Structure 1
């Protein structure tokens, strides 16, 4: 009877996309993965959008979230290249650019991209950076944005507490 995914729990399927964020230049391409089972997000920054940038991002995401059963992406070439298909086959991860979803596409990662860019803008401005964030402060700020969205430790819709 060995089938997934962790009891009756949700299946381990990720959605990944690249989004451009000039406040993070020169490594302005943010690769973002949302795990649809937990809604956890992993983001990494890249100088150019290539097949290798996608593989480097997923290598980091696997270290953080574990190996997923499948990854959903759009049809960009960094995801459909022979190189990327081989990398995913090496890890045994299924890939779809498909629609076995419940609504139009990969809404989850699109919402994540928006929340992430908003969070980076609010934190950077809080620190006094209204335009590009200085290169030496980018990593900590991106880490801070990722923490804020994942360990949202909140009352976001809760009752009084200390």
Structure 2
């Protein structure tokens, strides 16, 4: 479905990378944060929903599902907050693979960037433009445009 996103939190070095995946397309947005708190997650969701039509978010863990600050942001931005339980078991594997791919790209750009946050945004760029042949960026626009029409 065009409005469904999944939250994904992965760790690298001693730092936290928060990722939102548009499920139907594989398109992502991502940020480096000092730690995964309710407040950080809330702010990330607010940014995402202002930029794409976020209808449903599958949260990455129970703490963010429970967080009153995350719930407030979801209320504010008109997002249905749901769990991220992989009722289809292949969901876990897809997310795992993406985290590996992302860390691999981060490794490939580390001669070019002084800070992790730059490397992560380089990885977002490369991931979203990668032709698999359409790109994830092409797919999300097509999916949403078709829905509007």
What TM-score does the superposition give when structure 1 sets the normalisation length?
A: 0.69
Query: Which structure's residues are more often helix, by fraction?
Result: 2
Segments of 5+ residues of structure 2 without an aligned counterpart are 135-149
Choose which of 111, 114, 136 in structure 2 pairs with 1:134: 114
Q: Is the 8 A contact 1:51 1:78 kept in 2?
A: yes
Residues 99/50 of structure 1: CA separation in 2 closer, same or farther (3 Å cut): closer
The residue that corresponds to 2:130 in the other structure is 152
Taking the TM superposition and a 5 Å limit, the aligned residue runs for 1:1-162 are 10-22=1-13, 28-64=15-51, 66-99=52-85, 102-103=88-89, 105-124=91-110, 127=111, 134-135=114-115, 138-153=116-131
- Rounded Cα–Cα distance in structure 2 between residues aligned with 1:37 and 1:154: 14
What TM-score does the superposition give when structure 2 sets the normalisation length?
A: 0.75
Rg bigger for which structure? 1
Segments of 5+ residues of structure 1 without an aligned counterpart are 1-9, 157-162
Aligned residues: 134
Q: Is the 8 A contact 1:32 1:44 kept in 2?
A: yes
- Rounded Cα–Cα distance in structure 1 between residues aligned with 2:124 and 2:65: 23
- Rounded Cα–Cα distance in structure 1 between residues aligned with 2:36 and 2:125: 24
